[PDB]
Design a protein around this nucleic acid. Structure first.
Length: 185
RNA sequence: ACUGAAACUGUAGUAGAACCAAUCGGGGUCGUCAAUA
């Protein structure tokens, strides 16, 4: 049982997304910038509607990103001037141009949940495939969810933790966690 | 790769109960005084 991971270096974010786009289809992105943490959704093709401008670094731009869908997750972090390391995590063996494949054996993987911030807002956003949670603590949170949220729905980010031996003594740990999807409970 | 936000150590509770500032006492009445030569 292997967790496959694919790594590329000195690559810009928008190139990293494009180089992965056949796998990141419909992925939720979480982009990290000095001023904003924003969710995005890639097209079912995997593109983003302002991709270059959205993923540009040089003007308070994206220094870290995570893209996740059912099959895989892309991670990117800026090393210098908007060029940085991409790692894609997938439980499936897959081919990528330029990415060096690796793998980790893991003993088992276990489901985990994270409750998202907020209750369903009294109306969803005007954008299709978006919903609004809100909590007085943070205000609105627009999430790329296509289910119309019922009152007293709660949204959970589901993840899978991979457990492996860290020591030659046999000590186990969770070696990584892959984010999967938003789910309504 | 960037300070969280916002939140009254307040709310109720009598320094009080008990203890006599009191007990006894006719506003009365008679023998001297002094020490030397």
């Amino acid at each position: 049982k292997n967790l496959y991971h694919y790594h590329q270096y000195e690559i810009t974010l928008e190139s990293a997304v494009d180089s992965c786009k056949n796998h990141l289809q419909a992925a939720i992105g979480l982009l990290y910038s000095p001023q904003k943490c924003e969710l995005v959704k890639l097209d079912n093709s995997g593109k983003l509607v302002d991709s270059y401008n959205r993923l540009k670094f040089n003007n308070l731009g994206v220094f870290e990103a995570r893209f996740f869908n059912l099959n895989c997750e892309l991670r990117w972090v800026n090393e210098s001037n908007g060029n940085g390391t991409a790692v894609l995590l997938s439980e499936s063996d897959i081919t990528l141009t330029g990415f060096e494949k690796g793998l980790q054996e893991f003993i088992t993987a276990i489901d985990q949940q994270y409750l998202l911030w907020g209750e369903p807002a009294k109306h969803p956003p005007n954008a299709d495939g978006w919903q609004r949670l809100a909590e007085a603590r943070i205000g609105k949170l627009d999430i790329p969810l296509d289910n119309p949220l019922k009152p007293k729905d709660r949204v959970f980010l589901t993840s899978e933790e991979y457990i492996a031996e860290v020591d030659d003594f046999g000590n186990c740990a969770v070696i990584d966690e892959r984010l999967i999807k938003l789910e309504v409970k």
